[PDB]
Amino acid sequence: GDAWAVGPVTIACLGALATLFVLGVFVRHNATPVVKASGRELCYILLGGVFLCYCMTFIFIAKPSTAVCTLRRLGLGTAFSVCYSALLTKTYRIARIFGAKALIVYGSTTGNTEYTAETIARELADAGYEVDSRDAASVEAGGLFEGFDLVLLGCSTWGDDSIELQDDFIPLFDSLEETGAQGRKVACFGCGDSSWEYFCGAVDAIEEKLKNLGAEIVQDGLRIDGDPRAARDDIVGWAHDVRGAIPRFISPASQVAICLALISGQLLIVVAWLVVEAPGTGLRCNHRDASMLGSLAYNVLLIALCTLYAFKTRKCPENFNEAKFIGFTMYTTCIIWLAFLPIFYVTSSDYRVQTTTMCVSVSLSGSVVLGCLFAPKLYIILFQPQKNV
Length: 389
Ligand SMILES: Cc1cc2nc3c(=O)[nH]c(=O)nc-3n(C[C@H](O)[C@H](O)[C@H](O)COP(=O)(O)O)c2cc1C
Ligand SMILES: Cn1cc(-c2cc(C(N)=O)nc3cc(CN4CCO[C@H](C(F)(F)F)C4)ccc23)cn1
What we know:
The protein has 389 residues and is of the alpha/beta class.
C-alpha cells in the first residue's frame, strides 16, 4: 500500500540532496563575487524555501493526524512564500539600484556646460542610472520631467549689464510650470566667470524658480569658474552627492527585513486560518486547501508581482546577468502554476491523485529555482573559477 509514495519520496530525496549540495558550494565560496555580488542573504533564504518545497512531500505522504494536518496547512503556503518573497526582494533590489533613471537638460554656446553634462552623464551611468542627455534647443517643456527619478538642469550665464540665461534654455525656463517639477528631485549646474559681478546668476535663477514650483533640490548648484576641464575634479565630486538622491545600495539587513515582511503576510493568513479552523481528522484532514484559498491568492500575487518586475529588469548585466535567470525562473513558475492549478480543480474528487500531484508540482517548483537560477551560478563557481576572482 506504499507503492504510490516511492516516486514522490525519490524526487524529494534527490531534490533535498541537490539543494544541500548547492548550499555547500555557496557556503564554501561565501566571500566569492558570485555569492557576494547580489542578494546573498536572499539566496540563502531562497535555498531554505526550495529545501522546504521538497520536504513538503514527507508531509503529504504522512498519515493525517492533528500534527500532519497543522503542518500541511501551515507548510504549503509558507514553503512557496519563502521562495517567492526572496525572489520578489531580489528583483525589487535590482529595480531600485538600476531601475533609477536620470535626465540632463543643458544650455550651452561654447560647449562648456555641454562638456560638464557629458562628464556628469558618465558618472551617473557608472552609478547604474539610465541617463538621457538632451540639449535645451531640442527640448519641449510640456511633461518633460515625467518618468524621471532625477533631473539635472545645466545653464551658462549671459547678458551684458545684467543676468540672462543661455539662449536655448530661456523657452524651457519660461514654461518650467509644465515640466512636472513639483515633488521632483532636481539639481542645477552651470559654467560662468568670476570677472563678472554675478558669477553663475543663471543657476541661482533656475534654483529659485524650481523652489517656487515645489521641486526637491537635492544638492546646491554646481557653479564652475572658467574652463570646466580644469574644474573636472569638482564636477565628478559634485556627481558623488547627486547620485546619492536615489539609493544605489540597499543594506543586507534591509533586504532580509522586507523579505521577512512578505513571508509574514502568508504566516498571518495561514496561522489565522488554523486558529479559526482547528486542525484534525474525522483518512483525511478536517479543513482542505479548497475550504480557504487566501493562502493560494497571496502566492499568486507574489508570482504576478515578481514576474512583472523580473521582466522589467531583464536587461540588467549585474552578477553575470542574474536578472535574466530570475526571468527564466519566473516565466517557468507561471507555466507550472497555470498548468497545475486547473488539474487540481478537475481532479479535486480523488484524494490520492491530489496528494501525488501536489508532490510533483511543489517539487517541480523547487527544481525550476535550482535549474534556472542556481545551476548557472554553480557552473561559474565550479568550472570557471578565473571568472570568480
Ligand atoms: C556677453 C557675455 C556675458 C556673460 N555674462 C556672464 C555673467 O553675468 N556671469 C558669469 O558668471 N559669466 C558670464 N559670462 C561668461 C560665460 O558664461 C562663460 O564664457 C561660459 O563658460 C560659457 O558657457 P557655455 O559654453 O556653457 O555657454 C558672460 C560671457 C559673455 C561673453
Ligand atoms: C505549483 N503548485 C501550487 C500549489 C498550491 C499552492 C497553494 C498555496 N498555499 O500557495 N495552495 C494550493 C491549493 C490547492 C487546492 N485546489 C483545490 C481545487 O482547485 C483549487 C483551484 F482554485 F486552484 F483550482 C485549489 C491546490 C494547489 C495549491 C500546488 N502546486
